[PDB]
Curated annotation (Swiss-Prot):
Chemical reaction(s) catalysed: heme b + 3 reduced [NADPH--hemoprotein reductase] + 3 O2 = biliverdin IXalpha + CO + Fe(2+) + 3 oxidized [NADPH--hemoprotein reductase] + 3 H2O + H(+)
EC number: 1.14.14.18
GO MF term (any one): metal ion binding
Domain notes: The transmembrane domain is necessary for its oligomerization.
Residue ranges annotated as Cytoplasmic topological domain: 1-212
Gene: Hmox1
Any one Gene Ontology cellular component term annotated for this protein: endoplasmic reticulum
PTM comment text: A soluble form arises by proteolytic removal of the membrane anchor.
Keywords: Apoptosis, Endoplasmic reticulum, Heme, Iron, Membrane, Metal-binding, Oxidoreductase, Phosphoprotein, Transmembrane, Transmembrane helix
Protein name: Heme oxygenase 1
Species name: Rattus norvegicus
Length: 212
């Protein structure tokens, strides 16, 4: 069984749960506020900053290297534009750093520093979702908040070096399936993908509480 299929199948139940967190349910319905949207985007800024520091640390490591696509996929620079948009020119001092975000970041550096063979789990959970459902979420955010089609405020959701998110996804999956893989590694990659999903759920649970 191919890793990209093993992952999708191992995470479908928790994906359904993540979609049905209160925050994402509200989001899906068009009810996101500016405050709530800013909180989630500032959190992703920290998350992707950590993920991408660790992708760089491990770019030459064969347990990750086939998924090294910084130009196409990396989100940090995009999130920086979005922070300047939502929080202003001194965004670096304004943006929050919530404990649930700190928890996700911590685990990202553990994986990247000490278990890099699991990094694929974390890149899968974030990037493949961003290339799929993230596109749906973009439209909803756009309509809810009157964000222009020219893309300001939603750089995160825009992939200017990928023509077609579905074709890229297929490439990325085909490259996932070329990673060296024993049952040990595969079994733990899929466990870690489930933890990645949980760290996202816990962020959303925390954000919802902060907002209400
Ligand atoms: C309301 C919230 C969300 C909606 C509406 C949503 C929607 C979707 C849709 C429609 C797909 C494609 C289904 C398919 O190809 O068969 C998908 C794929 C994906 N989503 Fe989500 N999603 C949501 C939240 C999440 C969250 C919180 C994560 C992860 C943190 C996530 C991660 C993924 C991943 C990794 C994939 C790719 C699955 C695969 O092809 O292996 N999504 N999303």
């Amino acid at each position: 069984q191919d890793l990209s299929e093993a992952l999708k199948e191992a995470t479908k139940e928790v994906h359904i749960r993540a979609e049905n967190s209160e925050f994402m349910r509200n989001f899906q319905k068009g009810q996101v506020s500016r405050e709530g949207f800013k909180l989630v985007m500032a959190s992703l800024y920290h998350i992707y900053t950590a993920l991408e520091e660790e992708i760089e640390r491990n770019k030459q490591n064969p347990v990750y290297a086939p998924l090294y696509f910084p130009e196409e996929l990396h989100r940090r620079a995009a999130l920086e534009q979005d922070m300047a948009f939502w929080y202003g020119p001194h965004w670096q001092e304004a943006i929050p750093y919530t404990p649930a975000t700190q928890h996700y970041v911590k685990r990202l550096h553990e994986v990247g520093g000490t278990h890099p063979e699991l990094l694929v789990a974390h890149a899968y959970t974030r990037y493949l979702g961003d290339l799929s459902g993230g596109q749906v979420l973009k439209k909803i955010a756009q309509k809810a908040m009157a964000l222009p089609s020219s893309g300001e405020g939603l750089a995160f959701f825009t992939f200017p070096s990928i023509d077609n998110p579905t074709k890229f996804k297929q490439l990325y999956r085909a490259r996932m399936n070329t990673l060296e893989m024993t049952p040990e590694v595969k079994h733990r990659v899929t466990e870690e993908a489930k933890t990645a999903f949980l760290l996202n759920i816990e962020l959303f649970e925390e954000l919802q509480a902060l907002l209400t």
